[PDB]
Amino acid sequence: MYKKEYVIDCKGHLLGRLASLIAKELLNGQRIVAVRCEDINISGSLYRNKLKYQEFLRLRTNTNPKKGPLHLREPSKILWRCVRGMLPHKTYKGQLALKKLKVCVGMPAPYDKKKKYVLPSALRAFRLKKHRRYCRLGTLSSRVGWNYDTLVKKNEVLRKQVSKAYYKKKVNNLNEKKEIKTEALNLINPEQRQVLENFGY
Amino acid sequence: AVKKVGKIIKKRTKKFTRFQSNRFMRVKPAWRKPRGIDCRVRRRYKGTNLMPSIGYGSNKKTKFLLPNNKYKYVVKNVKEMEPLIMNHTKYCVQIAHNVSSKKRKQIIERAKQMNVSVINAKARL
């Protein structure tokens, strides 16, 4: 709601719920950068999802497929179409809401060093029972011909090496700050030190 | 919405429009009651040319009163202003459209002496 941009690590989120939650925020006016959409989960068995999608692919106008419903095969764009469904996009306020959303697979560069959030209400592990099948959107995308899954995976691995280096440095930095703080704690006047101590800082 | 000012509440503004006068030239703009076997407007369909009806009417203790707070009286001769000296606080003169400038001036002058408001004051000079 009140921040300039939420960046969302879509990994482990359930498609519909993530879309619905995103849509309400977009309508209100909060900007949303949806990243890493390939590990969006759709619920249920893979074969079922593929079959349903195959029927969606099958649907086309008789007259002229140029003006047929657009199919798309790219996971981020799948999420985007679903978000459009959950907004009143033929209106003008609605059109602005759709525009406010930006989606991308993997993580591009200006989003590399900004905090990813997770929506806990739409997290898979807290919403699908553990004996009931589930399915990765990226896998679904590969099966219906997206063919850009291996490349994204290669990129994820690369980012992780960068992340681990940054994190290791950061943890070390936190240690330096903590060490200085404890040492110079007893250079503070008693009364101020006591108040600070009282609230455990 | 309601257009309050002080003691004067008028409920409605935007002068009621004859249905269809938007989209045919021949249809006159001033009101007409639609008759019609079935037509939206008579039938009071949602959001379309809301029909006037009497209950909209101004309050009966303020029925005709100008924002002047004085009743309008049309005047074409100085003799006709002979009554309105006794109501100078509650009626205001308007000088009639026809009245020529020499006579009009005289009427303005008489009114000023008599301490009564003159609404179309600067007319034809």
């Binding site: 200085i180 600070l196 609230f199 455990g200 | -």
Partner: protein, 73 residues
């Protein structure tokens, strides 16, 4: 984590005598989540002067700490 060794049957009088005696609440308070809980309750309830006071003390801490870091090189 914490648990008392009470019988299944137990009712409130025996429970009061036992819970106090083995001091289990104290153990919870000493534990990290309990410690954070008591700090939180105070921090929520804190008065206007106290809110300023923490800022002043923290600002003083920042000055000393920054100076030490600058020294350290």
């Amino acid at each position: 984590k914490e648990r008392i060794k009470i019988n299944k049957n137990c009712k409130s009088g025996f429970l009061r005598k036992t819970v106090n005696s083995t001091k289990v609440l104290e153990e919870f308070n000493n534990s990290k989540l309990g410690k954070k809980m008591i700090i939180k309750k105070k921090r929520d309830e804190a008065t206007d002067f106290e809110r300023f006071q923490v800022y002043f003390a923290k600002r003083e801490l920042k000055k000393k700490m920054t100076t030490i870091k600058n020294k350290k090189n």
